[PDB]
Amino acid sequence: GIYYTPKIIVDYIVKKTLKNHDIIKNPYPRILDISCGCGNFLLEVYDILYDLFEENIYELKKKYDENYWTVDNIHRHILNYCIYGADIDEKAISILKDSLTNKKVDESDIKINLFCCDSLKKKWRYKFDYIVGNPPYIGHKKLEKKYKKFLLEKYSEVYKDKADLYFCFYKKIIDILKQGGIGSVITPRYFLESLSGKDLREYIKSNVNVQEIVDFLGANIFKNIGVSSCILTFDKKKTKETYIDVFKIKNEDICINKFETLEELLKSSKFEHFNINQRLLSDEWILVNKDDETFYNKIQEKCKYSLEDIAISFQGIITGCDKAFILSKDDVKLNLVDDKFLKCWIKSKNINKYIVDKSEYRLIYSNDIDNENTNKRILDEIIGLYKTKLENRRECKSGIRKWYELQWGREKLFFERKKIMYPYKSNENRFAIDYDNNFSSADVYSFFIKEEYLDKFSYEYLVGILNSSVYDKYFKITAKKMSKNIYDYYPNKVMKIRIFRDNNYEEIENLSKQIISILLNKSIDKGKVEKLQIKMDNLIMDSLGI
DNA sequence: ATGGGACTTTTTGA
DNA sequence: TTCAAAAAGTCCCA
Ligand SMILES: OC[C@H]1O[C@@H](n2cnc3c(NCCCc4ccc(O)cc4)ncnc32)[C@H](O)[C@@H]1O
Ligand SMILES: [K+]
Numbered sequence: 001g002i003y004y005t006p007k008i009i010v011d012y013i014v015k016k017t018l019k020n021h022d023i024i025k026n027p028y029p030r031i032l033d034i035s036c037g038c039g040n041f042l043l044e045v046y047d048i049l050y051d052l053f054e055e056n057i058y059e060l061k062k063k064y065d066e067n068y069w070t071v072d073n074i075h076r077h078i079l080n081y082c083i084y085g086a087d088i089d090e091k092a093i094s095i096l097k098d099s100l101t102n103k104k105v106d107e108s109d110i111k112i113n114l115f116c117c118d119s120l121k122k123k124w125r126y127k128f129d130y131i132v133g134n135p136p137y138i139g140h141k142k143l144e145k146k147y148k149k150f151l152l153e154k155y156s157e158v159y160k161d162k163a164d165l166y167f168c169f170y171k172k173i174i175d176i177l178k179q180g181g182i183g184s185v186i187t188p189r190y191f192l193e194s195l196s197g198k199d200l201r202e203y204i205k206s207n208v209n210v211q212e213i214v215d216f217l218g219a220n221i222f223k224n225i226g227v228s229s230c231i232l233t234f235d236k237k238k239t240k241e242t243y244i245d246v247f248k249i250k251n252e253d254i255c256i257n258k259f260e261t262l263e264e265l266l267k268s269s270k271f272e273h274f275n276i277n278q279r280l281l282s283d284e285w286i287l288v289n290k291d292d293e294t295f296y297n298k299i300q301e302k303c304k305y306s307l308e309d310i311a312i313s314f315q316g317i318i319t320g321c322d323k324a325f326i327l328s329k330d331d332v333k334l335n336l337v338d339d340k341f342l343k344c345w346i347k348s349k350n351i352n353k354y355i356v357d358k359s360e361y362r363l364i365y366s367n368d369i370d371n372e373n374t375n376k377r378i379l380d381e382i383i384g385l386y387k388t389k390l391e392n393r394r395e396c397k398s399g400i401r402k403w404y405e406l407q408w409g410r411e412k413l414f415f416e417r418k419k420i421m422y423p424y425k426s427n428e429n430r431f432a433i434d435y436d437n438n439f440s441s442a443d444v445y446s447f448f449i450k451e452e453y454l455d456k457f458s459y460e461y462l463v464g465i466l467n468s469s470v471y472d473k474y475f476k477i478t479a480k481k482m483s484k485n486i487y488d489y490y491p492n493k494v495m496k497i498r499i500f501r502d503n504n505y506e507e508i509e510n511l512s513k514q515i516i517s518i519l520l521n522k523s524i525d526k527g528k529v530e531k532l533q534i535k536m537d538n539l540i541m542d543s544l545g546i
Numbered sequence: 547a548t549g550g551g552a553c554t555t556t557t558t559g560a
Numbered sequence: 561t562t563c564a565a566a567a568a569g570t571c572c573c574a
């Protein structure tokens with residue numbers, strides 16, 4: 001329930017917000033953490049504030065009440081007017097109160113601005129100069145549905161559909177930041193590209209100036225946590241600048257403690273830096289260097305079609321309980337199942353470039369079982385072994401599905417045809433032509449070509465360009481980075497891939513047919529396939545003028 | 547034990 | 561009626 005932010009990142013975020021504060025002009029800064037926990041950020045804020053006041057104590061004494069501004073009074077002043085925290089966990093608040101009280105070694109009742117509450121519901125009675133911290137991340141499966149009602153009603157500007165709780169914390173932080181204030185947080189990176197983050201990105205862009213984005217990509221910032229992180233720093237300062245510093249990591253294998261500070265890491269060869277004009281951000285944030293932007297714009301301008309224009313996309317089967325319906329093709333229980341009910345079944349690891357592995361699994365398409373008396377053996381001995389769990393699926397509880405039916409069986413005829421399949425998460429482009437009427441779960445996506453576009457594009461040509469090094473780089477420019485060496489390959493981005501057709505079409509298609517032919521024979525030569533791929537990459541680069 | 551690698555279900559809002 | 565998105569992933573080992 002409580003996650004420990006690495007100290008190097010905590011110090012960086014606090015320094016980012018407070019390093020240029022003019023304590024003489026404003027000796028009453030309000031610094032807030034609305035998910036403060038045990039005080040990872042607030043205790044560091046205390047240290048930064050204490051040095052800031054002590055360094056200028058005589059200037060404050062001369063300018064202001066000379067009896068109020070003494071070194072002995074800094075501790076009381078910081079806790080009365082400067083440090084604010086909120087968290088739902090009262091045990092964490094109690095520990096943090098002890099820590100803040102123990103910074104100075106009662107006199108009279110020092111009051112500490114710590115609130116045990118839901119930060120998304122609190123009536124915040126003033127705004128803040130500086131806001132730092134690490135909000136909770138809770139996705140759509142793990143968030144309580146009753147709470148989702150409240151979020152959908154009151155945070156609809158950033159929270160719909162499959163959005164995340166931390167979207168709302170971005171909203172709350174922005175709303176209670178003072179004019180001219182600065183905020184700096186570490187959150188998941190996914191909202192930068194994800195479809196769910198579209199409204200949140202619009203909210204950030206139009207309400208704050210984004211100073212800086214640190215993107216750690218798939219690096220493991222939180223030990224033993226499967227999440228990918230970024231640091232955002234933003235302000236509400238009236239400026240004409242509108243330019244963002246982007247620091248994007250180059251090696252995801254780095255360990256965060258290479259230097260004493262994060263700034264040393266950011267300036268090093270481990271990161272690349274570039275600038276993005278916030279005014280030029282569309283609903284998508286394309287955060288790339290000038291070389292990649294030129295590369296991306298060339299391809300976009302050259303291609304007159306998208307996959308969406310020419311193809312029909314669909315997600316795979318969702319049985320709702322795979323162990324009930326998926327069997328090994330050598331399982332003796334398949335003797336009980338008439339072959340009309342059986343489909344070939346593949347996983348994402350079975351998709352290679354250009355062709356699919358031979359399937360080892362079979363799907364019982366139980367939707368075609370008419371009733372429980374004709375095929376009782378299949379229900380009693382195979383599917384019924386998981387009947388309790390099958391009955392807890394949403395559509396079974398509501399009576400839409402029989403307990404033995406697939407939850408989302410889709411349309412059989414979409415799968416039983418020539419089509420292209422690709423894994424939903426992969427390190428690289430792997431688009432394959434399926435010749436074997438393979439079915440799959442939602443870890444594999446499929447598309448087929450519209451009939452009116454068959455004379456312009458063939459499957460062989462499509463897998464040729466889509467598997468090229470050019471298109472691998474092109475897709476990853478805007479793709480959603482999930483974890484180390486993993487991108488989402490989902491239709492909401494895959495179908496936006498733009499394609500071209502020019503004088504090189506026939507030779508690209510012929511090279512693709514050679515590759516497929518080699519990949520499908522027995523005494524397979526790996527090597528010549530690579531040479532043919534290099535030749536095709538040259539044709540594609542020639543076509544797109546790169 | 548931890549940190550790194552292989553691999554990916556079904557719940558859920560719309 | 562029925563689509564497709566979602567990693568504080570999950571799980572294993574040396
Ligand atoms: O995880 C990092 C830190 O964030 C703290 N924190 C988590 N959620 C909140 C919150 N509102 C959101 C409430 C979400 C919720 C709703 C219903 C329910 O049944 C259970 C939870 N407001 C303030 N602090 C919060 C957390 O204690 C921890 O120290
Ligand atoms: K004075």
Ligand SMILES: [K+]
Pocket residue numbers: 217218219220221226227228229482483484
């Ligand atoms: K990661």
